[PDB]
Every structure is written in structure tokens, then in C-alpha cells.
Design a protein around this ligand. Structure first.
Ligand SMILES: [Cu+2]
Ligand SMILES: [Cu+2]
Ligand SMILES: [Cu+2]
Ligand SMILES: [Cu+2]
Lengths: 255, 263, 263, 255
């Protein structure tokens, strides 16, 4: 099944998670061809400013994600930032996410693999696609069996990322590949207008799933306000990329 | 709103080569009636890396060969110019005058093309940001051009590598029709020392991306036997694969098209 | 305004290695009295490309080895931390706590270093623009740091390549002391597949550039026999060359210094 | 002798050339260790806008450059844009300049080489340093004997250039190398503040000369207003980089 990872960037409140979780549950009922995984971060551990929102702590967030899993029967993903966090987070998380800046941190990867959960590694902005083979090898060494690599843009001069779609077939040689539709068009340190066009590209090229952050009111979000998708637009984008995938998939190269 | 397919061998290796590729593009033009085919081939590779590499058989031979394609098959023609004086003789045969990527900022070349009354297609320089094509279009409009295309062909990405930033397609659509160059976009410039290299395995996935994003046409070079080609041997599409790739293009365009944003 | 030279072997391969390099840095510290020497070595290569590559002998062994250098030679010490819990034990020996390039945005790591009361040196991430180091310094100041350095170590430039943008030196000088990393700046990340490569021939020319532009110090890894090193074998400076390079540094700094702009 | 190529970006008027030529003559009398070459463009053939200043034509410009050579006994350089221009320009120009965008145009290179003048090729923003070996080979094929390559920055994302100082020793393997101090810090499509620091770098690394545009009043210049050096600052910068060169040159590697 095609994967759709979606949810609000940050756990702003248990209330927010439930509102977004209600809609992702509704769509999971509508789209049985899709495996939905609910995402939200319990900590924004890498914000540019000391004064920006980080979150309500690991305990609160794991609590809130457990409420979503309980209330809606959705799989869960969240990211970890230091090795000690893997074990408590694996209590709720079906997929443990490794942040882009941290994709070379051997102990973090090994900690995630040890839990027995699937692991999804954000490809660092500094990494070449062929450099991800070694990432997967660390995770396999550590006992991971279900491994994803997520395309989320590459450093392109200052304060800009570019998506090199050659990465999708290259990374597919050693893991399942996810396209991150919302961070790929952020300007580190137009953005929203490119989210839909580039996700159409991703599915035309061929990937195993899409990652998209979504918020009932992105203008009021406490992180990535400029690129979270309005919740109301999520259904239309999911239908679109299923249609495009249905047609394009005839042509996906055997890797 | 017929989709454009610009296709042909990179260089005019001979009139015979042209007529062989021409016969296949004519055949495809009769099948894919919803496409506007334009036959491309360069009378001069004016910018090769090496003094030792094939350039061509001269402007007169090239125009004569292109004219034989138009006459025999009724195909529209495009070829590229390198200095202002070439615009007039080339306009005698070319429906679309192409402006090379390195020359996209040369005012006199742009004006020379524009005053011919022919359509003009500018290759976006590897050094240009997509928003800086607005002034390129302005120069052409100033010079009298009424039908203008901008072609995406990759951007300098460190040394001997190009990346395609697909954000460029909706940005450039604000002020011209947009073409995606499927075969130069995956070349590795200078990558072979005295020539450039390239990665044929990425041509098709990236053309699928281009039409899913949305463009007004594609550009793709094709040769009966690319490995024997005298230029871009690493990226030209085998002629036998052209049909299947055009069919895939059209299928993906159709299913994506309801989602194309109004620009 | 003593110039800083941070130097030592990339990784703590053994206590014996450290003491061998230490004896030479001590000797140079007695010659170049106008320099503040700081001995560097990593107790863990926490970010190697390959699971098969050398990481080290553990935090306890490493701190003990660094302490033996400080005790035997009276040298200041720096080493890098990878997770917040390491700041406290490391601060027991380290005069300067180093923040790795990939971790330069990790708030908790920065705060952990800052509350120790030690100086903090942050490697500028390969993904960061020079002006985005202002917020890094702000986090450190917020956390209690009073002595802060920013180290230039190259920027991602296409795949498997770094470039040094020397504009970064005057930009970063606006809000911290600036160090130039002469040996990681010429590495080719991942360039050897399962390891990174590098170009030793460019270390010296680029260090000459750094001091002509103006910086507050340099960072350079050195090994008696780099080709046998367990990490960065391609970029570590042979120990025998360290003296001549420091002398050249100081000479070029002196003649350039009247021209350094007030920031 | 170390080369200093200097002059106003564009031939705004014969009057301007004479004012700048007066100062470059004065400095050539002060610095006998230096070979001065006077530069100014008779055409800005590649401006971003159709409405920007190009110049007064080839005839006027070659006239004005001849006045400078006559009045002050200075060597001359100017750039050419199409092959036909090489012969008339070689009447006045000791060094024929090949523009950065045009560095792969075989006929332009061959036209310049045919004149018997020295040729200076601006390294394209798209070119890798090792790619310039083939440029020199074209010029040698065409009969050129005195060949320079000029470092003027490399495309670094959008609307930005970076100077990779590794280029200086690489290009030195096959030609004399010049550093362009003023276009290297322009933002295509802070700038002036980086001119002096990067020229100090260039001479610390080692080059055969520097190229710097200069104008009595850069704020009023009709091209590259943001990066031409005020004429009054030229003497101090020349003295500085001679001092740095004197010391650093002990360490220049044999290439
Ligand atoms: Cu986010
Ligand atoms: Cu071609
Ligand atoms: Cu190291
Ligand atoms: Cu200029």
C-alpha cells in the first residue's frame, strides 16, 4: 500500500492532534488503497531561534499521540533527537523518524533500530543520494527490518533547497522512499504554491509514499506556518496523487 | 494548447540522418494528432568543450538539410543560432529560432532572432534564476517577438553536474510558454574531460515529473544509434523509444491536467 | 588578540598518539609565544559515513587521555560533544567545548555546553548561511556562554564537495570570534563511498587566504603519519609540516593586519 | 611583473576614460613593479534589462581607448562579443577579453587568437576550474601565445556567486591566472564590503594579476554601480596587495 504520512508539524496541543486526527481517520476510511500514518513532533529541537516554539515535552507528546492512536486506530510516527528518547517513544510510535540534520548520528540510528520499530530517516540537506546506502547499512546492522528514506531537499546556495528527483530512483535501490512535500519547499533561515506541483512530480517519478504536514489554520501554526497544508485541502491532494500514481505507475522502472 | 514535442538528432551529422529521424517523427505526428511536432537539429555545435570535437558541416549545408526535412515531411523546423548574422538565413527555414543556453543574455542575438518574425525559444542559461527570465522575455517582446518559449535545461549544481529545479516551470509560465529539455538536463557538463557526460537512466523519470508539474511542451534529442552519435552520445534517446515516451507523456499530462494551477 | 591555533589528531587513536602530538605542540607553543595553542582530539567520531569505520575508545578513555596531555604539557584542551549528557564530564577537562557541524542547530546540545562555563566553539553546519549563525550565538549567550567561537569549515557545493565562501569570515565576526578549519574544509564528503575523501594540496593555499581575509584563529588536524590515520587520513597535516605552516600564518597575518576592516 | 587590470566598467564617455586613465598613469609611475593595463568595455552586450546602458558603439569606444593609449602610453584591454569584432578591436587592444558567458564560443576564441594579441578569458560561472584546460587548448590551436584565465566567481544557488580559491592553483597549470575582484562579489540579477578582503585572499593564495573596475563616482556609474571601486581607493589597495604578495610569495607552490 502507498503510504501517506500526515499531521501537524508540532504537538501544539492534544486538542489540535485530535482535530487533525479526526480528518486523517475520515480519509483513511475513504482511501483503503492507502496506509495513513499520523505524524507530529513532540519537540522542535532544531529551531533557528531560542525564542521559537519547541513543544510541551516528551511525556505530554507521547500522551497526546497515544490519544490519537487510541481514539482513531491510526499508526503513529514522531521524530527523536537523542538516543535515550527512542525507547519511550517506541511505546507509541510505529515508525521512528530520524531528523535530517541527525541522519549521520550513528548512536541515534542504532537506538531507533534497537526498539524493533520501523525507522524513517530524513535525508540530510548535505547528503548525496548515493550517500544514503551507508545510512541503511547502519540501521540493518542495528536490527532494523522496515526502513524508509525521505527526500526533503538539498542545500542549493544559501537559504534555499532544491529537490533533485534523481534521488528517488537512486534511494529506491536500498530502501522504501518517501517524498516530504512540505519541508522540501521551505526556505531555511514562494513556498506553499510549489507544494502541489512538486508532489505531482514525486508520484510521476515514483515513490513509496508522501509526507505532508497539515494544520486546520496554518497562518496560526507555531512552526512551519508558511508551508503546512490547510487541513481542508488534504483530501483533494490525496485523490490527485492516487490518480497520477495509477497512470504513471505503468512506467516506474524496476530498480 | 496542442502540446509541443521538439525532437531530432542533436547535430546535423548528415542530411541522410535527418531524413531517417524525420520519417519517424512524421509517422508519430500522424498518430499523435494532439501534438505539434517540431523537428530539431543543430547546423553547428558552436560551444563544444574540445577543439577536437564535431561541430558540423556549415550553415549552408545545415539549412539545406533542414529544408529537405520540411519539404519531404511537412514538419516544422527549429535550429539554434550563435551570432546575430545567422538569424536572417536561418529564418528562411526555421519556424522556431533557438537561442543557446550560454547566449540567453546576449541582447543582439535575441533582437536578431525577434525581428525575423519567427517564434523564438530561449534555452534558460545554467547560471540564470527562473525569475530572471522575465527580462529575457521583455527583450524579445521589445524586439518584435510574438511567440516566445523558455526552455528548462537544468541549473549549475556544484562542478560537472546539473539539477532541475521544477519550481522553474510555474515561475516561467508567468511570462512565456515553457518547454522541458529532457535530454540536456541530465548531461554532466565537461564530465568526460574533453566532452560532457550524462545519465540516460534519468531522462524518462524526469520527463514524467515535468508533465506532472505542467509544461507546454518537451524537447528531446533522438538518434537511431546514440552510441555512434557525434555529439551528446550519452543523452540522446534511441529513436525506437520515442513513441513509447510520447505516449507516456500524453497519458500523464491528461490525468495531471485537471490539477494544473492557473498562472 | 593572541591568535588561536587549535591543533591535534582528528581522533583519540590512543593516549600514546596524543602525547606524541602534544610534545610537538608544546614545543611550538614555546617558540610562537604570540599564539594561544589549544590541543584538539575527538573521543568519538559519532557521525562516520560507515558503521565499519573507527569511532574511538569511549568518553572515559578519551577524557583521561586529554587530561594526560593537559597535565604533562600544560596545554589547553578542546574536544567535541554529541549528546547533552556529555557536556558535564567533558567540561571537567575541556577548556573549549566543540559543537559538531551537523549538530550546530541542536538547541539542547548548545545549552548543555553553555551552562558548563567553558568556552564554546561551534562548527558552522554545511547547510548554514553565514548570517544564520547570529541565532546560534544568541542561543549560546541565552545559555550563559561568555566566550564563543564560530568555525568556518566549508559549505555544501553540489554532491561530495565543499566550497569555502570567505565572505563568511567578516560576516560571522559581527557576533563571535571566528576560526578557520583548514583541514575539514578541503574534505570531499562521502567521496570515497564508505568514507569521505579530500584534497591535501589545497590546505595551505586556503589557510593563507583565511589569514589574509582575517580571522581570530585557525583549526588544523595533524598526525605523525596521516596515511595511517583512522579518520580523515586524506586531510590531516603531517606533524612535521605544522611548524612551517604556523610560521607562514603569522607572517601573512602581520603584513595583512593593518588592512583588516573594523567590524 | 604582476598585472593590474583596472578601469571603468563601461566607456561612459571619452572624458571618464581620461579621468581614470590619468590616475592609472600616476600609479604606473609610482609602482614600477606592476604592469598596468587599462580596461573599459565599448559594449555591455549582456545586460539583464533592455533599458540598461550598453554604450556608444564600437567605433566610439575604440576611439576613446586609443586616446587613453596615446595620451598616457598605457596598454589597453576590452572585451569582444562576436567574432567580427576581434580584428577592429585588436587595432587598440593589447589584451582581447573574452566574456564569462562566451568562454565556450569556439569562433570567438579563434577570432581573438587570430589577431596575434594576448587573450584573457573570463571563466564562465558554469565552468569547473579543470574545464578551463580545453579553453586554453582552443586558443593555442588558434595561434595565441599569451593566454590568461580570470577567476570571477561560480554559480552558487540563485543570484549569488562564490569564489572557490582552489581554482587559482588549478588554472595555473595551463595559463596565467587573474583574479577579478569586482564582478566576483556582484549578485547576479553586501557586495562592495567584500572586494578588499577577497583580493587579499587572491594574492595570499597566489595569482599572476588582479582585475578591478574603478570609477571616480561609482554611485553614478551606468553599469555595476554597486561594485566599482572609488578611484580614490585604488592606490591603497594596490599597495596592500603588493605588500601581501611580497610576503606570501615565499609560499606559492610550484605548479
Ligand atoms: Cu515541520
Ligand atoms: Cu544536444
Ligand atoms: Cu577530523
Ligand atoms: Cu563590469
Amino acid at each position: 500500500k502507498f503510504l501517506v504520512i500526515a499531521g501537524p508539524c508540532a504537538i501544539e496541543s492534544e486538542e489540535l492532534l485530535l482535530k487533525v486526527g479526526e480528518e486523517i481517520k475520515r480519509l483513511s476510511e475513504k482511501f483503503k488503497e492507502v496506509e495513513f500514518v499520523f505524524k507530529s513532533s513532540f519537540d522542535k529541537a532544531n529551531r533557528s531561534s531560542i525564542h521559537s516554539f519547541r513543544g510541551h515535552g516528551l511525556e505530554y507528546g507521547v500522551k497526546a499521540l497515544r490519544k490519537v492512536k487510541e481514539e482513531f486506530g491510526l499508526k503513529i510516527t514522531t521524530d527523536i533527537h537523542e538516543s535515550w528518547q527512542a525507547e519511550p517513544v517506541a511505546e507509541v510510535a510505529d515508525i521512528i523518524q530520524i531528523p535530517a540534520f541527525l541522519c549521520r548520528q550513528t548512536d541515534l540510528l542504532l537506538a531507533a533500530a534497537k526498539t524493533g520499530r520501523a525507522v524513517n530517516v530524513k535525508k540530510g540537506q548535505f547528503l548525496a543520494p548515493w550517500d544514503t546506502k551507508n545510512v541503511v547499512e547502519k540501521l540493518k546492522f542495528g536490527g532494523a527490518k522496515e526502513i524508509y528514506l525521505t527526500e526533503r531537499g538539498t542545500t542549493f546556495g544559501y537559504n534555499n533547497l532544491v529537490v533533485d528527483f534523481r534521488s528517488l530512483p537512486i534511494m529506491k535501490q536500498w530502501a522504501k522512499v518517501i517524498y516530504d512535500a512540505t519541508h522540501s519547499v521551505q526556505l531555511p533561515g514562494g513556498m506553499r504554491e510549489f507544494i502541489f506541483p512538486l508532489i505531482r512530480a514525486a508520484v510521476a517519478v515514483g515513490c513509496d509514499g508522501v509526507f505532508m504536514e497539515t494544520h486546520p489554520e496554518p497562518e496560526k501554526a507555531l512552526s512551519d506556518a508558511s508551508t503546512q497544508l490547510p487541513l481542508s485541502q488534504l483530501e483533494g491532494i490525496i485523490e490527485a496523487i492516487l490518480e497520477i500514481r495509477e497512470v504513471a505507475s505503468k512506467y516506474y522502472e524496476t530498480i
